[PDB]
Amino acid sequence: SVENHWYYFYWYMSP
Amino acid sequence: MNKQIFVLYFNIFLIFLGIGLVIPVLPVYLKDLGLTGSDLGLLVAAFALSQMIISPFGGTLADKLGKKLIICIGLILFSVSEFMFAVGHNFSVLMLSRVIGGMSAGMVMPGVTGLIADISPSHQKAKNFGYMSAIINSGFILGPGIGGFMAEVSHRMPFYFAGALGILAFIMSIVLIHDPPQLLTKINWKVFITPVILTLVLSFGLSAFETLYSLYTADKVNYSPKDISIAITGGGIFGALFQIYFFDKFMKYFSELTFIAWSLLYSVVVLILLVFANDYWSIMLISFVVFIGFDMIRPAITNYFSNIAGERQGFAGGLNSTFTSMGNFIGPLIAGALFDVHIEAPIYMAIGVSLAGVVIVLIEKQHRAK
């Protein structure tokens, strides 16, 4: 699903 | 462009105007009631350290609860923080206000970056990042530029104005915005080192110069805040104009590393030229030159990050912000102590950090060539 998750200090895009 | 992106950029700009507001007044603030330069550096250092401490928790919270709500709460806390600064009278209340403001900034920014990344497709994850960089630099430069100006009448309302601006940003953002783990292990982090040190250097130099300039020029030439205002505004405008209207022209005839090295040499020479100057008009002219020098490096570093990251632009955009905060925290804290031990020491450390950057550029380039 197009949605971003937050790791430490940066966002990363779901597959 | 959709207005939502405009307001998301305006939030960044407001945060970095808050981070830069204090500098114009800095001498008269605490050399009228009996403080020293150490705490003058410590104030802005506390702001940036609060930002650093708080960004992870704020990011995570925002991810687990929402972005618009976090952004609005952040803006509210920033406005409250900035209004608290304008009513304090001792050092502890000012320290608490700066820490609160750091908190608001560090839990604002993750929401704004998340929303921008969520609204920009894969074809706009570079142009919008460049716009973010540009807005951050413009806000940081123009913070003092406007904070000096209205300080001349009713001294204690450049934070009143900032508070009012902040609540306006709050209400505009809530009304208009229509928004109802092992990845590291793979990473070699053996190429990311030199862009990280370069952005650390650049942030250190810019923040330390901004911190030391007001104190030095008020001590030697007895600058009123109007003079510091006009110097910083002119500097920033000249640098931004030279950037926008000649960057593409210089890229055709150099490489990124050589461009950065020559810009750094230009910066280090203009700093000593500033040291030797002892006149009002002279030191007024040197500001334009020094900001022209400092405005070139940042886009080169952003392009370097973009070209090395490849697909995962978020990682580079996060490292850039994290180490920009690192520089913004470590610069003024050292600069205050250096201005305490001597008068010309902060410029000497600026020289040193710039030459450091030159040397790392040189070594990096040498070992890529070999």
Author numbering:
A (entry chain C): 126 to 140
B (entry chain A): 1 to 180, 193 to 382
Question: What's in the article?
Answer:
Unlike results at pH 7.5, we discovered NorA did not bind to Fab36 at pH 5.0, indicating a unique conformation induced by the lower pH value. We deduced residues Glu222 and Asp307 of NorA were predominantly protonated at pH 5.0 by showing that a double mutant mimicking the protonated state (NorAE222Q,D307N) was unable to bind Fab36 at pH values of 5.0 or 7.5. NorA-FabDA1 and NorAE222Q,D307N-FabDA1 were purified as 1:1 complexes at pH 5.0 and 7.5, respectively, and used for collection of large cryo-EM datasets. Subsequent processing yielded cryo-EM maps at 3.26 Å resolution for NorA and 3.61 Å resolution for NorAE222Q,D307N, which contained the CDRH3 loop or the variable portion of FabDA1 following local refinement. Structures of NorA and NorAE222Q,D307N each displayed the inward-occluded conformation (backbone Cα r.m.s.d of 0.82 Å), where the substrate binding pockets were partially occluded from the cytoplasmic side of the membrane and fully closed from the periplasmic side. For the inward-occluded conformation, TM5 of the NTD was primarily responsible for obstructing the entrance to the substrate binding pocket through interactions with TM7, TM8, TM10, and TM11 of the CTD. Carboxyl groups of Glu222 and Asp307 tethered TM7 and TM10 to TM5 through hydrogen bonds to backbone carbonyls of Phe140 and Ile141 and to the side chain of Asn137, respectively. Nevertheless, the hydrophobicity surrounding these residues likely promotes the occluded conformation by excluding bulk water and reduces the effective dielectric to strengthen the electrostatic interactions involving Glu222 and Asp307. The similarity of interactions with TM5 and overall structural correspondence between wild-type NorA and double mutant structures supported the conclusion that Glu222 and Asp307 were in the protonated forms in the wild-type NorA structure and that the E222Q and D307N mutations suitably mimicked the protonated forms.
